[PDB]
Every structure is written in C-alpha cells, then in structure tokens.
Amino acid sequence: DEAGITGTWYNQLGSTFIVTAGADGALTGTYESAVGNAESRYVLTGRYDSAPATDGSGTALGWTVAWKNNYRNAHSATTWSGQYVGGAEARINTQWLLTSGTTEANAWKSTLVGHDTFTKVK
Amino acid sequence: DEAGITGTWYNQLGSTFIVTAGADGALTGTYESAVGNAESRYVLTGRYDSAPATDGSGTALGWTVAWKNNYRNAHSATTWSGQYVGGAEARINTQWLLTSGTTEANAWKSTLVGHDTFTKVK
Amino acid sequence: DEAGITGTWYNQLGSTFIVTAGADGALTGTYESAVGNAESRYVLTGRYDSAPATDGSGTALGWTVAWKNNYRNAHSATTWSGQYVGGAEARINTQWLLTSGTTEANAWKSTLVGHDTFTKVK
C-alpha cells in the first residue's frame, strides 16, 4: 500500500497530514494541526507494514511528530498508532498519545490520549 | 539532550532499544523485543524535542516500530510516546500503543496499550 | 444531568448500555456487547459529575463492566471514561480500557484500548 498511503490526508479536526511511504516501510512528511499549541508544518517520521496480510486486513502503521518547528516549541510529541484501510472510502484510523515534557512531580499528568480518523477528502 | 538520548537502552521486559538522536530532532535506530511475535532487530524512527525547557522538565519524544523485518512480519506497529529524563538515573518513561492490521469486524480489538521504562543499565 | 444520562444508549458497534444516574453521582445498570466474548447483559457500575460546569462543558463520567455473568466469563473488565453532552444530538463520548486476567509473562499484552460513542438512537 505504498501508493495508497502516500499523499495528503485530513482528520476530523481539520488537521493536514502529508506523507510519502517508502518501499521498505518508511513514512516521512509533514503535519499541520488545526488545534492546540501549533502553527504551520512539523516534521513527521514513521513506519508501516510494507507487506500486509491479503485477507482484507488493514495495514498497520505509526508516526511521530515533535511539536517543535521554526515558529513554536510546545515541548511535546504525539505518536499516532493505527491502520490504513484502502478502497473507495480509504481511511487511516488511529489512536494517539501526546506526551509533554514535565517535571517529575507533574509526570502523572504528562500524557493525553485520543483518536484521529484521516480521509483523502475534507 | 542529543548526547543523552543517543545510545543503547533497556526496558523492564529485557527489550533493547538502540538509537541515534540528530541535532534537528530526528531519532533513528533499531529495536529488539524480548517478548511477543518478534525476533532480531527492527527499524525504528522517531522525533524528539531538540530544544527542551530548562526548568528541570523532561524531553518529549516518540518513535515507531513496524514489526516487519527479514525474519518475521507480525502485521503490527508500536508507537512509544514519552519523555527522556537525564542525570545519574537517566530514564525514558513511555506509554505505547500497539496496533495490528485487522478486518473491519475486528478493528475494535486492534490496539493494545502499555507502558515501558527504559534505562541505560540492565 | 441526572435526567439526561438515565436511559438506554447505543454505540457504533451496536452494543446497548442501560443506565440509571443517581442524584449523588451514582451510575448503575446493564451492558450488552454486540461484539467479543460476551452474551446477554452484564452488571455495570460507575460515577458521574452530578454538578457539572454550566459553561457549555460536557459532564465527566465513567463506568466498569466485569465480563462475567450467568452465561459466560471472559476473565476481563472494561472501563469507559468520557463525557456526556446533552441537547438534540445527545452523546456520550468515551475512551475505554479492556484488561484481561493474565499470567505475569503475558501482562504486557493484557490491555486493549479503544473508543465508543453512544447515542440515544440506533
């Protein structure tokens, strides 16, 4: 699904995810969040299963964005873990973990959890 | 914390995490899991905050492993989200999401969640 | 939101959630899962914020189901954590953690994570 994953994706928050999938399983691109302490594009890197099951299963993948670029630094990183599903209604369904740099006293409240669904439209 | 993050790390399960941190915020290396449907080394890629807060806070980071290599393919990917804390007892404290490629009927049970703590010893 | 929460709810999987909210913050009822190692109704108990913010915010709540009843025992428990939002399109948006009883060797893969959205219709 190198061809299927590569391109521009949009989530339910209006965020924009631009990615190139390599033949080996590399994911590389940029992420632009429509919400939060973020502006403009951030580097993303990740991995995907380059030889997925051919029994109608989705393609497992994940990627990371560290929320530092030339404009801002939110001292945090989000990882998305999920699967790509092809076809007419192609989707990337994910759950994510956003961890912020904290003192040891605030480590217990360092990590947000959510879920994003990405589509080729919107 | 380019110097501090780069090197070999070990978690509570006995897994081995070897990483190089770039000046820009890149993480690159290999992961070897002591448990599960895995054998030998897998490529990992990630991001970290290359200019963290200097108020005693940890350094936010994340990385992904797709569980395909030359030996096995478990049709899944794990992302670790957490923070690096330096000093005598240097640690990377993480929470992770392991997503497997599934049919749409089994998507509800596609994602495991856990937490790993990595140290420079063990 | 004692009145608003009390009643029958349905999620995206077709599962049925029947609950009574007490004036103090108690949640009590039964849960029927449309998927997984489950059949018929299971006891649920939980808590909700009985005096929520009046600034348009949702009402925080949570509940637990242990997957043992007279028909089956799946040796597991799911907790849903989320918020109730009233109005025309009333919803309970949740994230959940399903933990299974495991040996210490399999504890790392003991917990599934997902998200359910419940509505008054369907």
Add this chain to the structure above:
Amino acid sequence: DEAGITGTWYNQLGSTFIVTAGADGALTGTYESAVGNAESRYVLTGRYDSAPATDGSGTALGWTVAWKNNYRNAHSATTWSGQYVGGAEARINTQWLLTSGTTEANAWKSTLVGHDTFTKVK
C-alpha cells in the same frame, strides 16, 4: 479473591485506595489522591471477576472515581482498568483514563492516560 482485594491499597504517588469486594463482583469504597485537584476522600465504585482463572492468571477489575465531593469538584472522572495479583507481593496493576468535562472545541485534549500500581504497603 474477595478476601485478597478487600482492604487498603497504596500507589506509587502516595494515593490511598480503600475498597470492599462483594461476593457477586461489586467493588465499593473511597479514593484519596496524593496529587492533583483533589482533597480528602471520593466515592469509588467498580467491578471485578469473582470467579477468575485458576492457572496463575491475575483477576481482572476496574473502578471509577468522579472527582466531586463535599470539598471540591474538578469536573472529571478517572477509571482504572487492571488486574489483581495475590501472594506475598500482592499488587493491583492498572492503567487509567482521566476525562474532564470540556467544550466541544477542547474535547480533543479532554483525556489523560497513565498507569498506577497499588500495593498493601507504603
């Protein structure tokens, strides 16, 4: 494990968890958090597997605390999902989800995730 679960438990943050396990699978008690927007005791309710596997597996359980009592209301609820393990070093290993009441615009950042381990000592 009705006998084993019932009593006072302490986590790594110094929080105190007092619970009575019923024969049917009920959990009832009070929770006192050593951290966060909390003071004194809060009602908790939950469920556990009252007939667990006898193959050395842990006992699945979960419970909820809504962070409202006579002293404070933090407009949030935490659910802990995990398993009880008996013996000399008896433990309750959990992962938790803390959801706060939010506006729809802030729903994406409504949920914290963490992990607590409870012991009979400390």
